[PDB]
Write an enzyme that holds these catalytic residues in place. Structure first.
Site, short mmCIF file in Angstrom:
data_model
loop_
_atom_site.label_atom_id
_atom_site.label_comp_id
_atom_site.label_asym_id
_atom_site.label_seq_id
_atom_site.Cartn_x
_atom_site.Cartn_y
_atom_site.Cartn_z
N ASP A 81 2.81 7.08 1.17
CA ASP A 81 3.87 7.52 2.14
C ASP A 81 4.94 6.50 2.15
OD1 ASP A 81 2.67 9.44 3.68
OD2 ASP A 81 1.42 8.26 4.88
N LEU B 194 0.97 3.44 7.68
CA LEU B 194 1.01 4.47 6.28
C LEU B 194 0.48 3.96 5.28
CD1 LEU B 194 4.95 5.45 6.80
CD2 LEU B 194 2.86 6.24 8.58
N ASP B 195 0.29 4.87 4.50
CA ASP B 195 -0.55 4.85 3.30
C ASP B 195 0.45 4.45 2.19
OD1 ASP B 195 -0.23 7.39 2.51
OD2 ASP B 195 -2.17 8.07 3.16
N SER B 196 -0.09 4.24 0.76
CA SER B 196 0.92 3.92 -0.34
C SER B 196 1.61 4.85 -0.61
CB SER B 196 -0.04 3.73 -1.32
OG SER B 196 -1.27 4.17 -1.55
N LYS C 2 -8.05 10.37 -4.45
CA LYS C 2 -7.52 9.28 -4.18
C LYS C 2 -8.32 8.20 -4.15
CE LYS C 2 -4.66 7.05 -0.42
NZ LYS C 2 -4.11 7.43 0.78
#
Ligand SMILES: CCCCCCCCCCCCCCCCCC(=O)OC[C@H](COP(=O)([O-])OCC(O)COP(=O)([O-])OC[C@@H](COC(=O)CCCCCCCCCCCCCCCCC)OC(=O)CCCCCCCCCCCCCCCCC)OC(=O)CCCCCCCCCCCCCCCCC
Ligand SMILES: CCCCCCCCCCCCCCCCCC(=O)OC[C@H](COP(=O)(O)OCCN)OC(=O)CCCCCCCCCCCCCCCCC
Ligand SMILES: CCCCCCCCCCCCCCCCCC(=O)OC[C@H](COP(=O)(O)OCCN)OC(=O)CCCCCCCCCCCCCCCCC
Ligand SMILES: CCCCCCCCCCCCCCCCCC(=O)OC[C@H](COP(=O)(O)OCCN)OC(=O)CCCCCCCCCCCCCCCCC
Ligand SMILES: CCCCCCCCCCCCCCCCCC(=O)OC[C@H](COP(=O)(O)OCCN)OC(=O)CCCCCCCCCCCCCCCCC
Ligand SMILES: CCCCCCCCCCCCCCCCCC(=O)OC[C@H](COP(=O)(O)OCCN)OC(=O)CCCCCCCCCCCCCCCCC
Ligand SMILES: CCCCCCCCCCC[C@H](O)CC(=O)SCCNC(=O)CCNC(=O)[C@H](O)C(C)(C)COP(=O)(O)O
Ligand SMILES: [Zn+2]
Lengths: 87, 63, 55, 51, 276, 98, 126, 177, 459, 94, 167
Positions: free
Chosen positions: A45, A41-43, H51
């Site tokens: 998330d 997962l990313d940040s 992003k």
């Protein structure tokens, strides 16, 4: 009124919610499994995960300490420590 | 904050009840007096002008 | 109730509806709390400490 | 009295107080029965209206 | 039989011309309200036992609730206004003690100080009315104050209107009843909901015989009652707190109650107090 | 710096004498300095005093005046005299100037 | 529109330009201030968490406050203008205002009583 | 509340803490869950794009216009949880959180009952005094090299030692007695 | 009245002769009974003032006080057994005797027929008080406070000395009885307009007026608890008692020579009440509360209407008891806290459950809750002030709102909120501390049942 | 226990005095901005931002919890006003 | 109470005229109150009064002879004037409980005659002014140091007016 939590009932709910997040595979989620380095997962998330937990257990994880609820377990002791569950 | 009350609620209740027994029994058996006319030269004493028995036992004995 | 019912229903339409200018004057209690509770207790205490007490 | 005599000191003050108090009454005895409001002839067997 | 009774239980001071005595009136307003209030109280104490279960100090909480009822009923059945004052100030102080039940929370403490401040501004009005009735016509007993019908009676009733606006959350100083909800929910029901707020409406019905004479004050409260009705109702539409919405509704309904008193219809205003 | 003592701490008198009543450090003086203070304080001043003060009779004549009024109001009304005439010192007694 | 901080309702942290400041200096103060507070924090936290202690933690920062506010005032008083003009309007201003408020009322009352208009009815007390 | 405040905030934590304030202030305008779970995955999109901006200047120009967009599109009465600062139960139960150094002035009668309780309490107080020395020394031996000091406290680093300054994070009033 | 006095004097021999260990109980137990003998003066079946003898008299105004003066000596000696329990056994017996002489002197001053007997005894009370404040005062500034307390009273005192010797030549005797039944009507000259100020000013100074009240905040701050109780409960009221008995003469001038003070007091009432609102020292706030609630009294002893006077008599006795109660509980916090700061020590009810009930009742007495003599008092002064000028309610109306705010703030920031983390642990409450309080409030409850006794001379 | 040098003094006239006071008050020498010298008594007391304790981070473990003030940090002159009860300078959405 | 100092009107009560089959819930209760509340009490009370009548005692009402009033009292003679300021301060109260009774007699006459107070109760209010116009004319302006010399002057300032106005 409701019954108090347990260190294994605060762990089954935390794994439950996460197993319902589509990105996190439900068969590779293990409590010692980091959200960003091991699951993928990313940040953004992480914020979304924590927020789910804040809504499953009904309280707010302070951001300064929520910015680190990485392992899917830190969430399980932090929630419990904040709620005084000595099992 | 509880030892205090058992002592305050006690030494009030110590001398308090014998009083309350005193006011009640006097007021019951002895009673306040009924007002009357000075009988042509009685010149009533200081105690004679007060109603309650307790409030005249003092006046007669001390004032 | 009829009018309130409709509006409430319209809410669930995947069409975002934000506040109108008045909604604020409605939700924060007409703004009597925001303004008359910050000015009076501030200009009544400032005058005691700063002016009547120390001066 | 095993050094409890101290106690009487204060009580005794009251007695002397009341005594000295009477003394003043004895002194301020004019108008015994001359007070217009209370001027009465001595009833039988009474030599002082107020003592 | 539709008959009333003035009961002078105990004398407190002769104070020369103005004798002071403890008097309970039993007029239609007093006994009708006494029955409605206790029924609500009987309901809430049982609710209180369930709601505050697990509170370590349940007994103290029940104790203050009945003390509130005693002050509230004294406020209801008070012949001389000095006793009305004992009730008016008395519910104010116990509300302070009960809004801030959970003293630890500063929010509860802030609301409690709010409530005392708004009530005290109202107290200035009652003191002014009391002082005017302590001079001019001379006795704080209602049975004599009502002989001041054909006098000016504006200096005084304006004072009681000021007292009602503070106690009954009219547009001026309307905010503490919303703030009062910081109290325990049972406390919110018996005092924030019924007995405490209606006290302002009750005072004016007691003094209405005088109110009918002065047209000026009648429209004054008709006007402010009206503004509070909508002002509070419009605020309630967007509030997202369940207790807050009900509290605003408490204020609006009393705004309607204020309106009927303003239209010089005292008996129906009392009827709404009971149904409310 | 001059010689002077180091700050004296305040003892927890409740550590020894766990029944400390606040009057004195040694226990017996403590007990006998409350057994005599609650007694002479509450038991025979607040009680015997209030008893005596309650029984002071017709204090400042206000028990006498509610009867004297009643006979005066009884006498004045039945004989038709004004209940509170409007001049007290009779006008005849007064010698006005000219 | 744009939020407009007033002496009250101040500019929030966000919406504040200086927050969005990352000049070397700012990030040198912002890290130099934590030190003072960390330093003070680790001077409160191992003196309050000290076993074997009965003495009163003092919080001298509060003692410097009270002294500054009730015993360091008159030693720092210099009578200027804006201070004596404002130091007389406050003591004698209303005190003279109400005198002409109470004299005028008391005089109005007295005149009316003298001329026979004030009713003073059922007033048997004062 | 537990961990210590960082001195300055990074770019990230400022962006990622808006994603919280924003999404949580979107569930106050959009109450129903569906509308929300919709109007919110659309929010991430906004953050999802922009992003990878590498141009810091730009990034801090999207952030500064995001937090003004947000300030003017926020809900006056958001949904703040019941027990969190600003909430409805915040500090409610604090009237029952006595500070535990008060059981030391109890009358020998009171502590007579509740016997085993004080038998374990006296053990813990022995633990506290038995390590203050090794703790403070640790706190000091590991002091900063004349450098920036944070409010962070070291872990134990040796068996038997107890985390330095642990008497008030442990042995702290229970949250909801 | 030599039983309220001679037995009192004998207390001094008992404080000295008695054992060091038993000195405290002999003195406190005996003066409790000394108060019981004092209660006999209350037996006034008739209106006639009780002229015990040539020099000693007691009328409705003095009697309610003589009893309070006798009552507080027991309490003062019970509130100072803690501090003053660290002394050398000869410093105590001095403090106990000092407290004893205050009520001996104060009992006589309140029970004195000759106005200059009042002056000699009036200004003597400063000697015992200055020693109590300066000798045992904790702070570095009591030397200063003592100076302020001696000079403000003394500079006022010598004008009264000249005035009373002056009236003795003008009338021929300073006997309050005669002066009352004799024709002393000042003639509104410029000089008389000075006489009036000479007589009232000394009384107006110790009854802090807005202009000269700085002595009282400074004095009570560093004064020991017993001195602060005496200053608030009996010492300040000496000024009021004097104004009631001295304005029997100087009858015509106060009609128009009072405006200056009345306005000084009512505006003063507002500002003194308000600065209480933000004052960090609790003893400081109670002292200004005392100035404001005493500013009401000088505004009722000057309007001079029957109701004012007994409003005054009601409030003076009532506020005396309430203030001490507040000063006494302030001390209990000060001794455990070790600081006068109001901000520290938050949450005490959590740790001292009952003292907080005493704090709550003291505050409700401080503000005007209605079934209290405190309210009856203000209600009456308020009424007359309204009669003087309907506008007065505005200023006596800003004070009521402010008085509610500071009275509850003392309760809200001292006895509620979260507990202070770890000040020196606060040892539990002694039974003496609690009784010293109970002894203050139980009489406040009993007097409120029958207000007639403290109603003053007027009614 | 408190030295006179550890307690407030007169308006810092020379720059060395303005840096000496900043130590006393545990502040940064470039943040000590003495209250304006108009002789109203402020003296050397720092002019700290006029922001109420209401917006002090409500989660951080403030030594003095309820004043939301740490131990040592310069107290504000009017903390009797901007406290969590009395006045609220806090940003408003409108 | 003296039916004549505290009067009280004769009672007129409508007679019971039930027009419903249902049973009145009041009459039944009273029938109980009269047995379980009144009889029990009634019994005790009597037994009180017989305990009283055994040693029946009496108390009289001090009658104060009338002394000379300030109007006639030498100037400076503190003796005579003292006995004469009391005789007045005494009548300052007897003339005050009289006014207490009119305060009271009225209060009752407006509880006993509600909705008619405007009219039926005007026997008193005419008196409450016949008594208030007098109390105002002999005791009102005076300070808190009310004395017979000052009533002597309050009157005599106005006896000029009933002589200057008349003239
Ligand atoms: C089946 C059972 C039926 C039972 C029937 C009754 C049986 C019975 O006992 O006979 C009654 C018989 C008394 O009745 P009685 O003799 O026919 O008539 C009484 C006399 O007329 C008078 O006798 P007395 O006056 O000598 O005795 C009574 C008196 C005794 O006096 C005392 O108690 C003095 C104090 C003693 C303290 C001791 C500790 O009680 C009082 O004085 C009460 C005063 C008021 C007390 C309550 C406070 C009211 C004011 C509260 C403050 C707030 C006011 C706000 C006002 C607001 C207005 C706007 O015996 C008693 O009960 C005596 C009771 C005494 C109680 C003393 C305690
Ligand atoms: C005095 C000047 C100021 C002195 C201050 C310091 C004094 C300390 C030392 C003395 C303390 C006690 C004496 C002072 C308080 C006296 C209280 C008192 O006397 O109460 C009077 C009350 C009867 O009230 P009364 O006025 O007769 O009735 C009114 C009718 N219109 O009598 C009562 O019934 C009181 C009952 C109270 C409750 C007692 C417990 C219940 C049983 C009795 C009911
Ligand atoms: C009549 C009332 C005062 C009317 C004038 C008020 C403004 C006076 C302006 C004076 C300007 C010069 C000055 O500084 O004040 C004079 C004196 C201090 O003078 P100095 O220290 O030499 O300062 C020189 C400045 N060029 O300091 C002074 O003498 C000030 C004189 C006025 C002070 C009034 C204070 C009244 C306080 C009442 C309190 C009541 C409660
Ligand atoms: C919050 C709520 C607080 C409520 C407090 C109410 C206090 C009311 C006080 C009233 C006192 C006077 C009553 C009678 C007033 C009146 O209408 O008639 C008499 C008045 C006499 O005025 P005078 O100065 O003698 O000159 C006029 C001559 N015709 O003739 C006049 O009409 C002149 C105009 C009088 C106007 C008086 C207004 C008073 C308002 C008081 C409350 C608002 C102000 C609060 C304080 C503000 C300042 C801090
Ligand atoms: C500060 C506290 C308050 C101080 C008040 C001081 C007032 C002035 C001193 C006393 C004034 C006074 O006593 O007034 C009356 C007195 C005598 O006046 P008179 O009646 O003319 O006497 C002559 C008889 N053939 O007339 C005087 O004594 C006037 C004396 C004025 C100067 C006295 C010295 C003042 C020093 C400062
Ligand atoms: C045009 C509009 C209509 C006409 C005007 C109507 C209003 C007139 C004035 C009424 C009183 C206004 C102030 C009332 C008190 C108050 O507002 O307190 C609120 C304050 C903050 O609390 P709040 O904003 O309610 O929300 C808490 C959120 N945490 O809580 C506080 O702690 C405030 C500070 C409390 C302690 C000091 C209070 C001030 C004391 C002196 C001033 C008293 C009020 C002004 C004088 C009386 C005015 C009638
Ligand atoms: C309801 C109120 C509406 C308010 C909406 C508000 O404008 C939010 C909006 O949509 S507009 C801003 C979108 N989002 C950014 O402007 C972040 C850009 N910042 C970067 O790109 C950085 O360089 C970094 C690489 C650190 C981000 O990476 P990350 O945060 O770690 O994942
Ligand atoms: Zn439950």
């Amino acid at each position: 009124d409701a019954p108090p939590l347990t260190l294994d009932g605060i762990k089954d709910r935390v794994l439950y919610v996460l197993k319902l997040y589509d990105k996190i595979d439900p068969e590779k989620l293990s409590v010692n499994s980091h959200f960003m380095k091991d699951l993928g997962l990313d940040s953004l998330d992480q914020v979304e995960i924590i927020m789910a937990m804040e809504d499953e257990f009904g309280f707010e994880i302070p951001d300064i300490d929520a910015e680190k609820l990485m392992c899917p377990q830190e969430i399980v002791d932090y929630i419990a420590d904040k709620k005084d569950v000595y099992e | 904050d509880a030892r205090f009350l058992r002592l305050m609620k006690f030494y009030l209740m110590l001398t308090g009840i014998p009083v309350i027994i005193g006011i009640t029994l006097v007021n019951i058996f002895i009673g306040e007096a009924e007002l009357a006319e000075i009988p042509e030269g009685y010149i009533p004493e200081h105690w004679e002008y007060y109603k309650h028995p307790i409030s005249r036992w003092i006046a007669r004995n001390f004032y | 109730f009829l009018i309130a019912l409709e509006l409430n229903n319209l809410t669930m339409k995947l069409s975002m509806n934000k506040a109108n200018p008045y909604s604020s004057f409605s939700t924060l209690l007409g703004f009597f709390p925001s303004i008359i509770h910050r000015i009076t207790p501030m200009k009544s205490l400032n005058l005691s400490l700063k002016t009547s007490l120390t001066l | 009295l095993r050094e409890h005599w101290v106690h009487i000191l204060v009580p005794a003050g009251f007695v002397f107080g009341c005594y000295l108090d009477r003394k003043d009454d004895e002194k301020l005895t004019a108008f015994r029965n001359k007070s217009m409001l209370f001027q009465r002839e001595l009833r039988p067997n009474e030599e002082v209206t107020w003592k | 039989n539709n008959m009333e009774y003035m009961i002078t239980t105990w004398h407190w001071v002769t104070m020369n011309s103005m004798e002071l005595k403890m008097s309970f009136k039993t007029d239609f307003f007093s006994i009708l309200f006494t029955s409605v209030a206790l029924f609500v109280t009987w309901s809430i104490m049982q609710f209180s036992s369930w709601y505050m279960h697990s509170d370590p100090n349940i007994n103290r909480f029940i104790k203050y609730l009945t003390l509130f009822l005693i002050t509230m009923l004294i406020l209801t059945s008070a012949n001389n206004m000095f006793q009305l004052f004992i009730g008016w100030e008395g519910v104010g102080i116990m509300s302070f003690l009960l809004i801030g039940w959970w003293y630890g929370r500063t929010d509860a403490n802030t609301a409690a100080l709010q409530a005392i401040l708004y009530n005290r501004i109202g107290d200035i009005g009652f003191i002014l009315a009391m002082v005017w009735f302590s001079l001019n016509m001379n006795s704080w007993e209602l049975q004599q104050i009502m002989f001041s019908n054909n006098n000016d009676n504006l200096i005084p009733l304006m004072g009681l209107l000021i007292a009602a606006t503070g106690k009954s959350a009219q547009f001026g100083l309307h905010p503490w009843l919303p703030s009062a909800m910081e109290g325990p929910t049972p406390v919110s029901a018996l005092l924030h909901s019924s007995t405490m707020v209606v006290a302002g409406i009750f005072l004016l019905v007691r003094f209405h015989p005088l109110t009918t004479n002065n047209n000026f004050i009648l429209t004054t409260m008709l006007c402010l009652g009206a503004l509070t009705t909508l002002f509070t109702a419009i605020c309630a539409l967007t509030q997202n707190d369940i207790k807050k919405i009900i509290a605003f509704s408490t204020s609006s309904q009393l705004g309607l109650m204020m309106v009927t008193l303003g239209m010089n219809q005292p008996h129906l205003a009392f009827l709404h107090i009971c149904t409310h | 710096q001059w010689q002077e003592d180091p700050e004296p701490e305040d003892e927890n008198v409740y550590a020894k004498n766990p029944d400390f009543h606040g009057y004195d450090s040694d226990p017996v003086v403590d007990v006998w300095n409350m057994r005599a203070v609650f007694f002479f304080g509450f038991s025979i001043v607040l009680v015997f005093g209030t008893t005596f003060v309650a029984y002071v009779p017709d204090y400042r004549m206000q028990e006498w005046a509610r009867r004297e009024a009643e006979r005066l109001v009884k006498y004045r009304e039945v004989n038709g005299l004004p209940i509170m005439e409007s001049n007290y010192f009779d006008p005849s007694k007064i010698q006005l100037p000219e | 529109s744009k939020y407009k901080p007033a002496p009250l309702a101040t500019l929030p942290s966000t919406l504040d330009p200086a927050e969005y400041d990352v000049s070397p200096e700012t990030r040198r103060a912002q890290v130099e201030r934590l030190s003072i507070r960390a330093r003070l924090k680790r001077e409160y936290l191992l003196q309050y968490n000290d076993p074997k202690r009965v003495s009163h933690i003092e919080d001298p920062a509060l003692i410097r406050w009270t002294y500054a506010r009730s015993a360091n005032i008159y030693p720092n008083f210099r009578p200027t203008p804006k201070n004596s003009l404002l130091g007389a309007v406050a003591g004698f201003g209303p005190l003279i205002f109400w005198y002409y408020v109470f004299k005028t009322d008391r005089d109005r009352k007295e005149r009316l009583i003298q001329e026979g208009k004030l009713d003073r009815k059922f007033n048997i007390s004062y | 509340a537990f961990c210590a405040p960082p001195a300055y905030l990074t770019h990230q934590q400022k962006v990622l803490r808006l994603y919280k304030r924003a999404l949580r202030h979107l569930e106050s305008w959009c109450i129903h869950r569906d509308k929300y779970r919709y109007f919110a995955c659309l929010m991430r999109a906004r953050f999802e794009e922009h992003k990878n901006e590498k141009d810091m200047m730009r990034a801090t120009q999207l952030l500064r216009e995001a937090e003004e967009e947000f300030w003017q599109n926020q809900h006056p009465q958001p949904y703040i949880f019941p027990d969190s600062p600003g909430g409805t139960s915040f500090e409610r139960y604090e009237c029952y959180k006595v500070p535990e150094w008060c059981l030391d002035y109890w009358h020998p009668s009171e502590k007579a009952m509740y016997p085993d309780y004080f038998s374990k309490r006296e053990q813990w107080k022995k633990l506290r005094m038995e390590s203050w020395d090794r703790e403070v020394k640790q706190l000091q031996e590991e002091t900063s090299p004349d450098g920036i000091m944070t409010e962070a406290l070291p872990p134990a680093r040796r068996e038997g030692d107890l985390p330095p300054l642990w008497w008030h994070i442990v042995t702290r009033p229970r949250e909801r007695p | 009245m030599l039983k309220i006095i001679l037995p009192s004097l004998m207390l001094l021999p008992l404080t000295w002769l008695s054992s060091p260990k038993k000195t405290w109980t002999n003195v406190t137990s005996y003066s409790f009974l000394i108060s019981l003998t004092s209660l006999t003066l209350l037996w006034q079946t008739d209106e006639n003032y009780k002229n015990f003898s040539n020099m000693f008299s007691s009328d409705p105004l003095s009697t309610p006080l003589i009893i309070l003066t006798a009552w507080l000596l027991p309490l003062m000696l019970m509130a100072s057994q803690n501090h003053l329990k660290k002394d050398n056994n000869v410093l105590q017996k001095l403090y106990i005797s000092m407290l004893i002489s205050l009520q001996i002197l104060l009992i006589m001053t309140f029970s004195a027929t000759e106005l200059i007997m009042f002056y000699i005894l009036f200004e003597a009370t400063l000697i015992p008080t200055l020693i109590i404040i300066t000798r045992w005062g904790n702070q570095t500034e009591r030397l200063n406070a003592g100076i302020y307390f001696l000079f403000y009273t003394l500079i006022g005192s010598i004008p009264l000395l000249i005035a009373l010797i002056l009236i003795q030549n003008h009338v021929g005797t300073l006997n309050l009885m005669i002066l009352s039944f004799t024709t002393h009507t000042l003639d509104a000259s410029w000089s008389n307009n000075l006489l009036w100020l000479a007589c009232m000013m000394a009384f107006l100074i110790k009854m802090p007026l807005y202009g000269v009240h700085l002595w009282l905040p400074k004095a009570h701050v560093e004064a020991p608890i017993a001195g602060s109780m005496i200053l608030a409960a009996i010492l300040l009221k000496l000024g009021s008692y004097g104004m009631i008995r001295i304005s029997i003469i100087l009858d015509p001038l106060t009609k128009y020579m009072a405006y200056p003070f009345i306005l000084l007091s009512l505006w003063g009432m507002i500002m003194t009440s308000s600065i209480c609102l933000r004052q960090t020292d609790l003893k400081s706030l109670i002292a200004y509360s005392s100035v404001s609630h005493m500013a009401l009294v000088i505004a009722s002893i000057m309007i001079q209407t029957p109701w004012s006077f007994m409003g005054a008599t009601m409030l003076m006795i009532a506020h005396g008891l309430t203030s001490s109660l507040l000063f006494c509980l302030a001390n209990s916090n000060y001794e455990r806290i070790h600081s006068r700061t109001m901000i520290m020590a938050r949450g005490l009810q959590m740790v001292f459950p009952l003292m907080a009930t005493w704090w709550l009742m003291a505050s409700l007495a401080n503000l005007a809750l209605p079934p209290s003599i405190n309210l009856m008092g203000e209600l009456f002064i308020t009424m007359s002030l309204f009669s003087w000028s309907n506008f007065t309610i505005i200023l006596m109306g800003i004070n009521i709102i402010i008085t509610g705010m500071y009275s509850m703030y003392m309760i809200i920031t001292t006895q509620r909120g979260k507990l202070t983390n770890h000040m020196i642990n606060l040892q539990p409450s002694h039974t003496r501390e609690l009784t010293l309080m109970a002894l203050h409030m139980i009489p406040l409850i009993l007097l409120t049942t029958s207000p007639k006794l403290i109603t003053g001379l007027t009614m | 226990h408190m030295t006179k040098d550890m307690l407030p003094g007169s308006y810092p006239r020379t720059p060395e005095e303005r840096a000496a006071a900043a130590k006393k008050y545990n502040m940064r020498v470039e943040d000590y901005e003495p209250y304006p010298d108009d002789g109203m008594g402020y003296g050397d007391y720092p002019m700290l931002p006029n922001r109420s304790q209401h917006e002090r981070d409500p989660w951080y473990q403030w030594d003095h919890s309820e004043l939301r003030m740490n131990w040592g940090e310069p107290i504000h002159w009017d903390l009797d006003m901007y406290i969590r009860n009395r006045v609220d300078t806090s940003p408003t959405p409108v | 109470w003296d039916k004549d100092v505290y009067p009280e009107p004769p009672s007129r009560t409508p007679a019971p005229s039930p027009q419903t089959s249902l049973p009145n819930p009041i009459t039944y209760l009273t029938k109980a109150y009269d047995l379980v509340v009144d009889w029990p009490v009634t019994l005790v009370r009597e037994f009180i009064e017989r305990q009283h009548a055994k040693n029946r005692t009496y108390y009289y009402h001090r009658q104060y002879r009338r002394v000379p009033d300030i109007t006639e009292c030498k100037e400076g003679d503190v003796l005579c004037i003292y006995e004469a300021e009391m005789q007045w301060r005494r009548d300052f109260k007897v003339d005050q409980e009289i006014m207490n009774i009119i305060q009271e007699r009225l209060k009752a006459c407006q509880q006993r005659e509600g909705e008619n107070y405007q009219q039926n109760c005007a026997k008193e209010l005419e008196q409450f002014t016949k008594v208030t116009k007098a109390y105002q004319d002999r005791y009102l302006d005076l300070g808190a140091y009310y004395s017979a010399r000052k009533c002597l002057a309050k009157q005599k300032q106005r006896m000029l007016e009933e002589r200057k106005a008349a003239r």
